[PDB]
Motif scaffolding. Sequence first.
Motif, PDB file in Angstrom:
ATOM      1  N   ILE F 595       0.852  -1.182   0.000  1.00 23.14           N
ATOM      2  CA  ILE F 595       0.000   0.000   0.000  1.00 23.14           C
ATOM      3  C   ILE F 595       0.891   1.236   0.000  1.00 23.14           C
ATOM      4  O   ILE F 595       2.050   1.201   0.427  1.00 23.14           O
ATOM      5  N   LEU F 596       0.359   2.334  -0.524  1.00 19.72           N
ATOM      6  CA  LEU F 596       1.086   3.592  -0.618  1.00 19.72           C
ATOM      7  C   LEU F 596       0.269   4.679   0.061  1.00 19.72           C
ATOM      8  O   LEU F 596      -0.946   4.760  -0.137  1.00 19.72           O
ATOM      9  N   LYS F 597       0.934   5.506   0.865  1.00 17.05           N
ATOM     10  CA  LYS F 597       0.285   6.604   1.564  1.00 17.05           C
ATOM     11  C   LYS F 597       1.077   7.882   1.340  1.00 17.05           C
ATOM     12  O   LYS F 597       2.311   7.876   1.392  1.00 17.05           O
ATOM     13  N   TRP F 598       0.359   8.978   1.097  1.00 17.36           N
ATOM     14  CA  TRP F 598       0.981  10.257   0.797  1.00 17.36           C
ATOM     15  C   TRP F 598       0.021  11.378   1.168  1.00 17.36           C
ATOM     16  O   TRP F 598      -1.179  11.159   1.355  1.00 17.36           O
ATOM     17  N   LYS F 599       0.566  12.583   1.273  1.00 12.87           N
ATOM     18  CA  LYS F 599      -0.196  13.796   1.511  1.00 12.87           C
ATOM     19  C   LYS F 599      -0.347  14.569   0.205  1.00 12.87           C
ATOM     20  O   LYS F 599       0.417  14.341  -0.739  1.00 12.87           O
ATOM     21  N   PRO F 600      -1.383  15.416   0.073  1.00 13.39           N
ATOM     22  CA  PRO F 600      -1.486  16.266  -1.120  1.00 13.39           C
ATOM     23  C   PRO F 600      -0.411  17.339  -1.129  1.00 13.39           C
ATOM     24  O   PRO F 600       0.026  17.802  -0.062  1.00 13.39           O
ATOM     25  N   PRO F 601       0.044  17.770  -2.309  1.00 12.30           N
ATOM     26  CA  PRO F 601       1.107  18.780  -2.364  1.00 12.30           C
ATOM     27  C   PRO F 601       0.579  20.186  -2.091  1.00 12.30           C
ATOM     28  O   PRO F 601      -0.617  20.416  -1.905  1.00 12.30           O
ATOM     29  N   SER F 602       1.520  21.135  -2.072  1.00 10.36           N
ATOM     30  CA  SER F 602       1.223  22.513  -1.691  1.00 10.36           C
ATOM     31  C   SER F 602       0.453  23.273  -2.764  1.00 10.36           C
ATOM     32  O   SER F 602      -0.224  24.255  -2.443  1.00 10.36           O
ATOM     33  N   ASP F 603       0.545  22.847  -4.021  1.00  8.04           N
ATOM     34  CA  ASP F 603      -0.224  23.460  -5.090  1.00  8.04           C
ATOM     35  C   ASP F 603      -1.406  22.569  -5.431  1.00  8.04           C
ATOM     36  O   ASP F 603      -1.193  21.431  -5.882  1.00  8.04           O
ATOM     37  N   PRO F 604      -2.655  23.010  -5.204  1.00 10.25           N
ATOM     38  CA  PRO F 604      -3.808  22.251  -5.712  1.00 10.25           C
ATOM     39  C   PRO F 604      -3.919  22.357  -7.225  1.00 10.25           C
ATOM     40  O   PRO F 604      -4.146  21.344  -7.898  1.00 10.25           O
ATOM     41  N   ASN F 605      -3.750  23.599  -7.720  1.00 13.41           N
ATOM     42  CA  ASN F 605      -3.660  23.979  -9.143  1.00 13.41           C
ATOM     43  C   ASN F 605      -4.904  23.586  -9.942  1.00 13.41           C
ATOM     44  O   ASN F 605      -4.817  23.100 -11.071  1.00 13.41           O
ATOM     45  N   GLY F 606      -6.071  23.800  -9.341  1.00 10.35           N
ATOM     46  CA  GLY F 606      -7.326  23.409  -9.945  1.00 10.35           C
ATOM     47  C   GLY F 606      -7.837  22.115  -9.354  1.00 10.35           C
ATOM     48  O   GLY F 606      -7.720  21.888  -8.146  1.00 10.35           O
ATOM     49  N   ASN F 607      -8.413  21.262 -10.194  1.00  9.12           N
ATOM     50  CA  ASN F 607      -8.798  19.929  -9.753  1.00  9.12           C
ATOM     51  C   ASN F 607      -7.570  19.039  -9.630  1.00  9.12           C
ATOM     52  O   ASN F 607      -6.727  18.998 -10.531  1.00  9.12           O
ATOM     53  N   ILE F 608      -7.465  18.330  -8.509  1.00  9.79           N
ATOM     54  CA  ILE F 608      -6.568  17.182  -8.448  1.00  9.79           C
ATOM     55  C   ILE F 608      -7.225  16.081  -9.274  1.00  9.79           C
ATOM     56  O   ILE F 608      -8.239  15.506  -8.864  1.00  9.79           O
ATOM     57  N   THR F 609      -6.688  15.831 -10.469  1.00  8.10           N
ATOM     58  CA  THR F 609      -7.298  14.859 -11.369  1.00  8.10           C
ATOM     59  C   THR F 609      -6.971  13.438 -10.931  1.00  8.10           C
ATOM     60  O   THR F 609      -7.870  12.656 -10.598  1.00  8.10           O
ATOM     61  N   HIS F 610      -5.684  13.099 -10.903  1.00  7.65           N
ATOM     62  CA  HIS F 610      -5.240  11.790 -10.454  1.00  7.65           C
ATOM     63  C   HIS F 610      -3.824  11.898  -9.917  1.00  7.65           C
ATOM     64  O   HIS F 610      -3.119  12.882 -10.155  1.00  7.65           O
ATOM     65  N   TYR F 611      -3.418  10.867  -9.184  1.00  2.01           N
ATOM     66  CA  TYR F 611      -2.039  10.711  -8.749  1.00  2.01           C
ATOM     67  C   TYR F 611      -1.377   9.664  -9.634  1.00  2.01           C
ATOM     68  O   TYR F 611      -1.803   8.504  -9.654  1.00  2.01           O
ATOM     69  N   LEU F 612      -0.343  10.073 -10.364  1.00  2.29           N
ATOM     70  CA  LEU F 612       0.313   9.199 -11.336  1.00  2.29           C
ATOM     71  C   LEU F 612       1.313   8.328 -10.589  1.00  2.29           C
ATOM     72  O   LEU F 612       2.469   8.701 -10.388  1.00  2.29           O
ATOM     73  N   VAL F 613       0.862   7.148 -10.176  1.00  3.93           N
ATOM     74  CA  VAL F 613       1.683   6.217  -9.414  1.00  3.93           C
ATOM     75  C   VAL F 613       2.271   5.197 -10.377  1.00  3.93           C
ATOM     76  O   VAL F 613       1.535   4.434 -11.015  1.00  3.93           O
ATOM     77  N   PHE F 614       3.595   5.182 -10.480  1.00  4.59           N
ATOM     78  CA  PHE F 614       4.313   4.215 -11.296  1.00  4.59           C
ATOM     79  C   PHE F 614       4.943   3.157 -10.403  1.00  4.59           C
ATOM     80  O   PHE F 614       5.424   3.462  -9.309  1.00  4.59           O
ATOM     81  N   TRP F 615       4.937   1.912 -10.872  1.00  5.71           N
ATOM     82  CA  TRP F 615       5.676   0.852 -10.208  1.00  5.71           C
ATOM     83  C   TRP F 615       6.327  -0.037 -11.255  1.00  5.71           C
ATOM     84  O   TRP F 615       5.758  -0.296 -12.317  1.00  5.71           O
ATOM     85  N   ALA F 698       1.685  14.457  -9.216  1.00  7.49           N
ATOM     86  CA  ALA F 698       0.395  15.086  -8.946  1.00  7.49           C
ATOM     87  C   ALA F 698      -0.084  15.765 -10.222  1.00  7.49           C
ATOM     88  O   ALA F 698       0.438  16.817 -10.606  1.00  7.49           O
ATOM     89  N   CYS F 699      -1.081  15.173 -10.873  1.00 12.46           N
ATOM     90  CA  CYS F 699      -1.574  15.674 -12.151  1.00 12.46           C
ATOM     91  C   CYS F 699      -2.771  16.586 -11.907  1.00 12.46           C
ATOM     92  O   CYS F 699      -3.819  16.136 -11.431  1.00 12.46           O
ATOM     93  N   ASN F 700      -2.614  17.868 -12.234  1.00 13.19           N
ATOM     94  CA  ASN F 700      -3.689  18.841 -12.106  1.00 13.19           C
ATOM     95  C   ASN F 700      -4.549  18.953 -13.357  1.00 13.19           C
ATOM     96  O   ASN F 700      -5.593  19.612 -13.314  1.00 13.19           O
ATOM     97  N   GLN F 701      -4.144  18.329 -14.462  1.00 11.05           N
ATOM     98  CA  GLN F 701      -4.890  18.395 -15.712  1.00 11.05           C
ATOM     99  C   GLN F 701      -4.780  17.061 -16.432  1.00 11.05           C
ATOM    100  O   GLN F 701      -3.675  16.544 -16.617  1.00 11.05           O
ATOM    101  N   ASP F 702      -5.923  16.508 -16.835  1.00  9.37           N
ATOM    102  CA  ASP F 702      -5.965  15.193 -17.459  1.00  9.37           C
ATOM    103  C   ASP F 702      -6.522  15.213 -18.874  1.00  9.37           C
ATOM    104  O   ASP F 702      -5.883  14.680 -19.789  1.00  9.37           O
ATOM    105  N   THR F 703      -7.700  15.809 -19.084  1.00  8.78           N
ATOM    106  CA  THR F 703      -8.430  15.655 -20.344  1.00  8.78           C
ATOM    107  C   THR F 703      -7.866  16.508 -21.497  1.00  8.78           C
ATOM    108  O   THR F 703      -7.629  15.928 -22.568  1.00  8.78           O
TER     109      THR F 703
END
Lengths: 24, 24, 24, 24, 823, 823, 16, 18, 16, 18
Positions: F595-615, F698-703
């Motif tokens: 499992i992975l746990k994290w806090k949101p970053p200091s810039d919201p920058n609009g909608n938090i769209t998704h967290y790009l988690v790579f493994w 932290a991806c602020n823009q997706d579409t």
Amino acid sequence: GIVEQCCTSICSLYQLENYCHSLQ
Amino acid sequence: GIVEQCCTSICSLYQLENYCHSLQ
Amino acid sequence: GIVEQCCTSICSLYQLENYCHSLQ
Amino acid sequence: GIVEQCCTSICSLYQLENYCHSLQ
Amino acid sequence: HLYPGEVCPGMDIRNNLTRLHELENCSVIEGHLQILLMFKTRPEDFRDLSFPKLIMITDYLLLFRVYGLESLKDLFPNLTVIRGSRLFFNYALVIFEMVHLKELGLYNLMNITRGSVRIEKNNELCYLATIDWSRILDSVEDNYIVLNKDDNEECGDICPGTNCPATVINGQFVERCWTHSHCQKVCPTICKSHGCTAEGLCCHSECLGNCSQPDDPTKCVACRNFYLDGRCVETCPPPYYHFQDWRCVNFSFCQDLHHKCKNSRCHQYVIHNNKCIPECPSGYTMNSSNLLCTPCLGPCPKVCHLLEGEKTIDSVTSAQELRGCTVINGSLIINIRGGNNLAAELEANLGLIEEISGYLKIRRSYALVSLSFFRKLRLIRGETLEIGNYSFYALDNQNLRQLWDWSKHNLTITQGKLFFHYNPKLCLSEIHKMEEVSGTKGRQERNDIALKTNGDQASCENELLKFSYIRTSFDKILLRWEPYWPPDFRDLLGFMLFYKEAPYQNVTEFSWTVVDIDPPLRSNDPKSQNHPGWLMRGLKPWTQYAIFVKTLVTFSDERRTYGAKSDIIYVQTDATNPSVPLDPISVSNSSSQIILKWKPPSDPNGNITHYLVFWERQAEDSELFELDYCLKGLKLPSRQILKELEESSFRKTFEDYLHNVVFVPREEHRPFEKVVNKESLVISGLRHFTGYRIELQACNQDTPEERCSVAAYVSARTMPEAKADDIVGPVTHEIFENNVVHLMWQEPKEPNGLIVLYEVSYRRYGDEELHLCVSRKHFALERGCRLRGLSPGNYSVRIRATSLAGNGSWTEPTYFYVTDYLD
Amino acid sequence: HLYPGEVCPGMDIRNNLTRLHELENCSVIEGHLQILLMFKTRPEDFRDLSFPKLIMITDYLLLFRVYGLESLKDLFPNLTVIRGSRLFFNYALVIFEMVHLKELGLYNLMNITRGSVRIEKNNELCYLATIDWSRILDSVEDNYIVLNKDDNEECGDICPGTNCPATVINGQFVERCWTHSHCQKVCPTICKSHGCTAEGLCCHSECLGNCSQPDDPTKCVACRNFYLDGRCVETCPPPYYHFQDWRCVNFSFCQDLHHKCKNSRCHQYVIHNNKCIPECPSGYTMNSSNLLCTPCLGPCPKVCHLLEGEKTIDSVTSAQELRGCTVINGSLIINIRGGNNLAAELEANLGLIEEISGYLKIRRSYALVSLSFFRKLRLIRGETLEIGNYSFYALDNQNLRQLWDWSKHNLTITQGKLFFHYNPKLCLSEIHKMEEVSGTKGRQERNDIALKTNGDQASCENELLKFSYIRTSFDKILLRWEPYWPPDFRDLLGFMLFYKEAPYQNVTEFSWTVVDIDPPLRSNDPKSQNHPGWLMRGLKPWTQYAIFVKTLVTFSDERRTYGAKSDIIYVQTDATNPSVPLDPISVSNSSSQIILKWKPPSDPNGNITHYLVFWERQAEDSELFELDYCLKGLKLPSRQILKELEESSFRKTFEDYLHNVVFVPREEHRPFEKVVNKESLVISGLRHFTGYRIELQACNQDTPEERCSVAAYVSARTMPEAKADDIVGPVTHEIFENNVVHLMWQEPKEPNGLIVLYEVSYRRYGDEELHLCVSRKHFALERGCRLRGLSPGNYSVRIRATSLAGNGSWTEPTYFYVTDYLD
Amino acid sequence: HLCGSELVEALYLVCL
Amino acid sequence: NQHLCGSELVEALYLVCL
Amino acid sequence: HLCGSELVEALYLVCL
Amino acid sequence: NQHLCGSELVEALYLVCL
Ligand SMILES: *[C@@H]1O[C@H](CO)[C@@H](O)[C@H](O)[C@H]1NC(C)=O
Ligand SMILES: *[C@@H]1O[C@H](CO)[C@@H](O)[C@H](O)[C@H]1NC(C)=O
Ligand SMILES: *[C@@H]1O[C@H](CO)[C@@H](O)[C@H](O)[C@H]1NC(C)=O
Ligand SMILES: *[C@@H]1O[C@H](CO)[C@@H](O)[C@H](O)[C@H]1NC(C)=O
Ligand SMILES: *[C@@H]1O[C@H](CO)[C@@H](O)[C@H](O)[C@H]1NC(C)=O
Ligand SMILES: *[C@@H]1O[C@H](CO)[C@@H](O)[C@H](O)[C@H]1NC(C)=O
Ligand SMILES: *[C@@H]1O[C@H](CO)[C@@H](O)[C@H](O)[C@H]1NC(C)=O
Ligand SMILES: *[C@@H]1O[C@H](CO)[C@@H](O)[C@H](O)[C@H]1NC(C)=O
Ligand SMILES: *[C@@H]1O[C@H](CO)[C@@H](O)[C@H](O)[C@H]1NC(C)=O
Ligand SMILES: *[C@@H]1O[C@H](CO)[C@@H](O)[C@H](O)[C@H]1NC(C)=O
Ligand SMILES: *[C@@H]1O[C@H](CO)[C@@H](O)[C@H](O)[C@H]1NC(C)=O
Ligand SMILES: *[C@@H]1O[C@H](CO)[C@@H](O)[C@H](O)[C@H]1NC(C)=O
Ligand SMILES: *[C@@H]1O[C@H](CO)[C@@H](O)[C@H](O)[C@H]1NC(C)=O
Ligand SMILES: *[C@@H]1O[C@H](CO)[C@@H](O)[C@H](O)[C@H]1NC(C)=O
Ligand SMILES: *[C@@H]1O[C@H](CO)[C@@H](O)[C@H](O)[C@H]1NC(C)=O
Ligand SMILES: *[C@@H]1O[C@H](CO)[C@@H](O)[C@H](O)[C@H]1NC(C)=O
Ligand SMILES: *[C@@H]1O[C@H](CO)[C@@H](O)[C@H](O)[C@H]1NC(C)=O
């Protein structure tokens, strides 16, 4: 000679477009 | 009933020797 | 009234004889 | 003087003909 | 030397260069020279002409909108001393709005006597900050040099070095430069104002600036005090008279200047005290035969008339026009917009006046601190009045604190009213004291003096609050005072207590954090009266503070505002024990010593006497003596307020209305160390690779018994030795009769901490490495090691010891052949 | 029910209890009752008497210094509704300075119509905060209850619970209590003001408070509007007339009260609009035969005379005395010391006046916001004047913003001057607009209106600065505006820019941090003109701010101060990429998931769209494949400003003096996850006990394509399995012909990470434990393990595998007898 | 504001 | 003989003619 | 106050 | 025809009688 004078010494705005009109 | 009212609510001085004259 | 005689100014005793008829 | 004629108030041209004798 | 040239009174040059040709044979200038408004000029028009004979300017030099001049040294290369008899907005050198000027070039100046230098608005000017003005001028804080190219930009001041003297102005030794090839001459300090020559020798006492021969009165370039035929003199001998404080003239020169004003339209000169003076002062008169100021009998003053009633005093050049006056015809409007202290020069110019016919008006003056420069002001007549019938007007004076000192000074105001507005360091007690001295008590109307603007920044409460009962503790102060009552007791809102820490004793009046005090409850008897006080809490131990108490009151305009205050007294916390000595770090170089490093704690609490460092050798653990580490499990550790004012006045107004409506008429010694005045301590003489208990305390008191802080605990361990874990001594064997080898060796007596395991690596020839583990209880059981049931042959036995630190060194391979029982 | 009792007009009780005996048969009180100044009383003097018949007070009830009364319920147990026709400093219930009073006991009150309740200075009072005053009063913010024993101390309010309704006052449901055995009656909200009965049913529409029978006009305890013979009515039918807004009387009662004032010394009653009124209003008159207000012909107003010229308006009880007036004989001194908004009641009382003969004076009023309550003020005569010849006086009005609205309102001031001081929300444009409307332009002297006190807290600069050119970036705003010039351009000091962040749109005018702007340089042509602006820097991304620009000017009293300002506009930063997603922590429950746990970053920058988690599965190190861990070295990792104003005015004064003197006239697809709207993500489907590379963005823009932040790197490893390192399969042996044992076993194919060592614990019977180390290259060399040169006998071989995680499980002891070659 | 034994230290100090 | 305001006015005025 | 590449980003933004 | 102060006073007054 602008990059050590428009950091934390803090500077105004007129020299920025004066340097922009000196570069172009 | 003085120890929750002379902490961080902050209080004056007259009730302290009033409580001292009530205890003795 | 009473306050401009004996609070802003100095009050004598015979005017308090005159003014205690509201008690009497 | 000059300042109470043409800085606090409106200045005409013929009084500047009169007042440029300090240049002339 | 002498003065080759004519006297040359000061002329004015405008708009074309033809009248500059009259300065050929001019050595001195008696007057002012103004080179102004030079429009149709070129730099080719200025380099072909020079006037090197000119030495002295008396009054001032003014430059205003001169084009094409890039340095002024082509004009004046030998200008020495600017005197400053008459001034120019208290300056003697005004350089204003020079276009195409890049440098000054005025290398021959080192003294200007009276005035300052203001240079501004020159758009191409450099070499400004490379001149030390402290040896040029006297009042160097009244300089005003701003808004040029030398402070807007960073133009290259090429200085002659390879030679100029490098002096200090704030913290740095930079060279003093005028041009790219002219140094600034700095004399040694034995030559105080007389100047030095080219080899640095001091000149004559009546020399000034430069001399060709040192200690020579005939070889001064400029005279210091007076001039007489090539001899610089301190005073004029008779029959020569003083003239304009710089030269000696005779009787015929002042008589001819009298005759050139009596037979013409002007300054008709007189003589008094062997000085040719423009006018006789008060008490003197004018004869017909001789020109002397003989004493005029009776009251015979000097009366000066003002132009159309009003004279606006703005600077020293307007203040010097009223020099020597006693009776002023009209009104003085003193308006000095400043920033520099001009009270001494206004004291030296004014103050000889006695009577003012009009009104004295002070308006918008920032830099005054007192109005005591009028030393002889007695009678303000007020024949011409300010509209509103005021003989005195005081508006927006920012730093005006005192009018006069009423121990000695006195003023008689005949007519007119008074006026006071926006004077924030001036108090109504001083205004009413001038009202009582001047006798103008029942003369002005109401709201002619402001009530809320005056004294809002100055603490002039004029009552004293004595601190009655002060006791200290560790970090708490019991403050007390005598109770004060304004005569309506509900107008007292409380006490406006102020506190600050005080590292020094000269703490200023009026940061500065605040707590507010509830008012006391009087019991209408003088028996106890309930001395109000405040329990001051939450302090720093061993810190001097600054405590004063001001009374917070409610305004009423029928009286004064109100006032009571206390002096700024100081209190000392003394404390008992300091805090925890922090940063516990343990550095252990080598094996027999441990150094200790720490920071000082948060409480100094007086002298740091010593750091109480305790050390004691902690023994090893009992559970590791018997545990078999040959078994599985061998892991070993490697060691706002105005709403409340309105609420109080609302309660007073409700009590007012209710009384008006209702009442109607008809131990163990551990080894320790007194560690004085160092933050480091080596603890030597140790057992190697064992734990220690380190207790550190901060003792603030040693000699009247030991007061020390709460302890800090840390543990440490040294580095291991090299050969403490190395097995010394030979390894001998006891081969039994049934191929059993019993191994004897000498163990390490003092190893690094303790040795937990004895590994055995024994190798028969033609075989591989075979392992056998010997623990501590295996060693105590077998007094060594025992091998049972082995193949015959020659063996190579190497034994290492594994300690708490780690492995030691291997033993030598003991070659022994056990019994084959075959051959 | 009905009213058993007499009408009982209001009397006054003083100093002895004998006149309290006249309240026996009193049902209602027409007037005010004041029980005041009761000195020689005891608690035994008060409990033996009761007056339970009294229901209604019209005007007010006043208590002042009454001793010995501990609750007032012994006097009045049935007091229902206080009306409030005449008031008492806008209160109808004043309880002042009760000694030995502990509780109220007034359980039968639930409506007071007009006024408030002020109770203070009762030194033993409790049960104060347990009364919900919101259902008692209408204007509940004008209450003033302070300085008693219930807020100084913590006395025990014993409440009847075991029953009182628990209502809310700020956030808590506490019970509403009057005494220790009396609950407070709270009606349901369907009974709005009519009240409820004992079972909670709503009463009649003309009932008020309490009814014995619900929906019954004959069974009201108190009438709401009017009373007529036991019937509560909304209006009086003819021939019954209205009287004092509470009851219906006939013609003979108002006629007899007319006859009891005409034949006596008073309020001679008239009738108008079927109401028995004290006086006829404007336009009406008095006959001789009938009592009606017949219309008086011509201008026939109501003229009210003031006592000795001055009337001090202080509250509603002084404002109600001037009700219905039109012409005022004298001057009004309005002085309302307040804290509550009294403009509506002063609007309802005053405003019918037309002409004031004297002067209007406003002084020290805090709670006024406007002077528009005079709806009909036309003519201020000023026959009697304030000293100083003022017909208008305005001093220290704190919150006074507008005089009147000059779109409709107009005022004609005949004589007298004007006066304005210390009005900080009032502006000189509004003062000059009243001067232009009233026609008093050239009438006052100079400094009758203050210049610096007025409008110092209110932004009324009355000029608009348009923002011209706005561009945004990541965190920088280019602000621009049109240039503004005051007509002396050196008086402009710069631009006084203010900035604040704005989470909302309704940002207030005039925290609020500041930067200062240098003034622009004009080139005296209208071609370019150098639009000044400011490069705004150092912001927060995706944050709405609040930007407005005010002009910083220099005061001159011959004109106004000066003024130009901009509207509070808002600007949006929009940004590109957010910051680093912080708190990298790696929790690995079980073996196949992390499992992975994290806090949101200091810039919201609009909608938090998704967290790009790579493994991605990282392989093991190459250097641990071949290293012999049977050798020594077997350690394996277990994984101020006014001086500048004076400087600018000093430069302007020097330019003034210089011009006056001079000018004279003649890729690779890693497995990743779109992790939407959660701060946790399980990453399952894994290899057990290996390292992974975890990249988080932290991806602020997706579409409209993927904009993601700078990556955060962390590594993790799972827990080991139980039987991955356990050796499965039997261990078989190859005994050679010269006592050489070659050992075959099945290795673990998928262990926990990797297995570095194979330990062999083999034991012959009659012998001890013998050790032999097998590494990985030893296993690859010998395809297992080989034993060479051993003693004959039966052996017990147990083999464990030591991995990167640790030891596995031992194998079974394989019993094999090698060849002795003896028997 | 003083939570702790500074209160009983404080009414040692107010009552001497 | 000071100024008499507040509650001390009625407390001193009660002792005048008791 | 901006030490870094925010100056050359800033005189991109003042000069468009 | 505005107000003429400062350096614009001498700069406009120079163009009057040149
Ligand atoms: C300047 O030139 C004018 C002619 O244009 C002449 O009359 C005047 O005398 C000249 N000024 C001086 C000081 O010679
Ligand atoms: C300087 O000397 C020459 C030569 O006699 C003379 O003509 C000239 O007028 C002198 N200069 C002055 C300013 O007198
Ligand atoms: C001093 O005066 C002499 C002649 O009077 C001159 O040659 C020399 O250059 C002067 N030096 C300075 C530093 O003024
Ligand atoms: C000063 O003295 C000289 C000679 O000593 C003579 O010309 C006259 O007496 C005086 N001259 C002047 C110009 O006053
Ligand atoms: C100056 O003041 C004195 C005072 O008495 C007066 O006599 C004299 O006439 C005044 N002179 C002028 C020119 O106003
Ligand atoms: C006014 O002051 C002087 C000294 O300051 C003093 O000698 C003189 O007597 C004073 N005048 C009066 C009338 O006291
Ligand atoms: C260890 O440190 C102490 C403290 O400075 C020093 O005196 C000593 O010589 C050091 N010993 C070695 C072996 O470095
Ligand atoms: C420590 O003591 C010395 C003299 O004993 C004194 O001069 C010094 O100021 C003291 N320092 C402190 C911090 O108390
Ligand atoms: C109070 O007592 C006095 C006698 O002391 C008496 O005259 C007076 O009438 C009494 N007051 C009332 C209201 O009865
Ligand atoms: C109440 O009734 C009794 C009995 O008739 C009477 O004497 C008394 O005066 C009445 N009370 C009042 C206040 O009228
Ligand atoms: C009291 O009665 C009046 C009568 O109109 C009504 O307006 C008011 O709302 C009532 N108050 C409460 C609290 O019900
Ligand atoms: C309401 O009135 C009746 C009689 O009029 C009375 O018995 C009852 O106690 C009253 N209740 C309240 C809550 O006032
Ligand atoms: C009101 O009416 C009653 C009977 O209806 C009668 O006494 C008279 O007309 C009036 N009474 C009074 C007291 O006005
Ligand atoms: C009240 O004012 C009017 C205004 O004309 C005047 O006639 C009348 O006499 C005044 N009355 C009194 C009593 O002052
Ligand atoms: C004054 O105002 C009223 C309405 O506000 C308006 O009808 C009237 O005409 C105004 N008076 C004048 C003289 O314009
Ligand atoms: C490990 O954690 C995940 C996340 O909640 C959970 O779904 C899973 O059942 C857990 N597995 C074990 C063996 O605890
Ligand atoms: C995220 O998006 C939803 C709708 O897509 C919107 O309502 C919400 O306010 C957004 N939140 C943020 C922080 O941008």
